[PDB]
Symmetry: C3
Subunit: 301 residues, 3 copies
């Protein structure tokens, strides 16, 4: 079976200096089936991703049963699969100054590429959830060695609370050229009625020149070394009637390179029927950074 859904948005976005019109529309194909014994299977991708979905680079394919779910393609890594992101600000998703996304080390297109899908396994039973993910270590479908990513995460929900932890790592094919990386995460999520609170703390080490590129800094001409880092953040959103209001703040601190605090604040108003008016403000504390903002409408179909 093949089902269709879609979304679209239109409005004005401020890039720090000028306003521009910003709009888009997308269609999602959701495909599903069930075998004779009740294993469920499916696949999905968006219309603008159709070339990539044909090589494994975009979209996902899955098989699930009593054993849990196996998904291959452009999949999330294990930690992101269980804890997600902080409150999304602005109708265009204003990630220009850092954004709402939590800084996971693996999955979500870190190594996914043409002819190179990644794997995500999930399982839940009651109150508990576990996820595990990995890439295959070879470029495309070739025999050339690639960096290889892997992660494992577990969560437990008790009442209003889910708490969890994840561990992620990237193994370098050549540690003279790129240091191995790893990150450990603790995440907590709480709903107190109309209010959602999400918080995380992450700690680990990154390749030096990969870390410098986060801050848009040229690499140093030396053999690869690792730098220690930490990241933590929080978001709060609450709904009163048709109005949701929310925001987040995150800081990323990489030893010997730099630190940044980035944040955003936005609101939406539900018009019903799949339409909402959405606007927001986002920034970070780096020297140059002017605040980005937007105001428009989002539609679901």
């Amino acid at each position: 079976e093949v089902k269709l859904s879609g979304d679209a948005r239109m409005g004005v976005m401020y890039n720090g200096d000028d306003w521009n019109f910003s709009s888009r529309s997308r269609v999602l194909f959701t495909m599903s089936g069930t075998t004779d014994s009740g294993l469920e299977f499916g696949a999905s991708f968006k219309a603008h991703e159709s070339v990539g979905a044909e090589t494994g680079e975009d979209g996902t394919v899955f098989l699930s049963g009593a054993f849990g779910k196996i998904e291959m393609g452009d999949a999330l890594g294990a930690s992101e699969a269980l804890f997600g992101d902080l409150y999304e600000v602005g109708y265009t998703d204003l990630d220009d100054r850092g954004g709402n996304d939590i800084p996971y080390l693996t999955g979500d297109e870190r190594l996914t590429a043409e002819d190179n899908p990644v794997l995500l396994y999930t399982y839940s039973a009651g109150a508990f959830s576990v996820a595990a993910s990995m890439s295959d270590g070879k470029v495309g479908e070739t025999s050339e060695d690639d960096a290889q990513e892997m992660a494992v995460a577990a969560a437990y929900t008790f009442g209003n609370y889910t708490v969890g932890l994840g561990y992620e790592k990237i193994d370098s094919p050549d540690t003279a050229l790129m240091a191995d990386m790893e990150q450990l995460e603790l995440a907590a999520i709480a709903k107190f009625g109309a209010t959602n609170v999400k918080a995380y703390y992450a700690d680990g080490e990154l390749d030096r020149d990969f870390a410098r590129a986060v801050f848009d800094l040229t690499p140093v001409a030396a053999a690869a070394t690792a730098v220690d880092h930490k990241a933590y953040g929080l978001s709060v959103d609450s709904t009163f009637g048709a109005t949701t209001v929310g925001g987040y703040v995150q800081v990323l601190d990489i030893d010997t390179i730099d630190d940044v605090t980035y944040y955003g604040l936005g609101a939406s108003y539900d018009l019903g029927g799949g339409a909402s008016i959405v606007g927001g403000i986002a920034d970070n504390d780096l020297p140059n950074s002017d605040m980005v903002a937007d105001l428009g409408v989002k539609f679901k179909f």
Copy 2:
């Protein structure tokens, strides 16, 4: 909600010297919704446009209410939105020698580009219609200055007749490099039963080197100047049973560069069920020009 429709065509096309097979198929995604108070919203794009629809370059998104309709993306400019084009000739739409399209100055991909949608506002009440359109003046979603287009048009229907006028303009970011342009249009449309008649007259001024490029002439190495131009045309089509027969003639006259008269004549025969046999002939009076022609079938799905 997401609906599907499509079209396809196949036949033989003569390019002035040789015949070639010419065929295509397309799918249109039409998405729609209604808010709780009855504002209607939607989006559409074709499958071959899906990459562009995701940045605002192709397809359109709209919101309408009692106030009229706001559309953003790859939109028509205000004059084209109210008066359209002359009778379309040939199953492949034989625009090779000039074509049936009326020469509007703005909208319809004049400035629309990646991350750069344009805006069209329309409103009707009874017998009267107004449209207004503009681009935002900045390249992409950047702060780089772009040419900016704008147009306004109004029409009035009285019986068999709609008459209207439009005014369009493009403001140059640097008039040493490209002159400002403007065009005023008068259009009339009349249906006399099975017969449709459409006529327009346009007058204004164009950038010199933009005008020379219409006639495929190299630019002159001097500071930009403006040239005066006029354009006018007429088409007639009539239906008798399953057969429609029609044609058009247009002339474009640009002062100090050149003039051209271009025309076409074609027919279609409806087979019912969404299929028709369509063929046509088109040419212009320039020196080289051999007549283009085609014959094939068009399908709607």
Copy 3:
């Protein structure tokens, strides 16, 4: 009318030296209609082919009636349209060492390209079938001369047996640069209940440097000459319950260049509901060649 269907696959594939994850998903658009007198028409293409389907390069458009069926776009040539391919091995279709496809000389993207569809005509009456195909001889929709392909084939079914023959040819635009080519085929297909047997023999001549490129050999710097070739193969597959087992062997023998025997063996297990577990092995006898293999699941939607 527009209908949707799709497919997806995921598993592990061995390239001769290493295992890699390999997955994809696709959506097919099938469009159909009927005229008032009952001529049927349609078009189809897959979502990843939507750009190509808009110029004639990918997908097909057709019209059929009592006269047979005319199809234009990315069509099969006449022989492939009647006799098909040998048993397909592996969930990824392991064609890496030669594959299951029968080596037809024309159609199936030999000359199909942007703005350049090819034509396939088919007709059946009772026990007999005929097909005829051709390209138009001009590059794109231009007047530049291209190689031109053509083929004719006929088949007759009597009981469990279909036997047939086809003749295919490519006319070179310049025989100093590329020799003319031709191939004659005899094919037989037999179903003996759960068992399918397909066999063919082909004989003809190929351009020298086109033949050398099959074996990945550099061209010779001389005026084009033709080399004689023969190809023949067989496949057998049988189904017992949910299990199909099958394989094929083909040899290609080009005089003065080289010969190769390539083969594959695979199985599938139907899980019902549109899902199957599929795996296979394939190889050829050339010097370097290590065996390719895969194991995964295929889904239809």
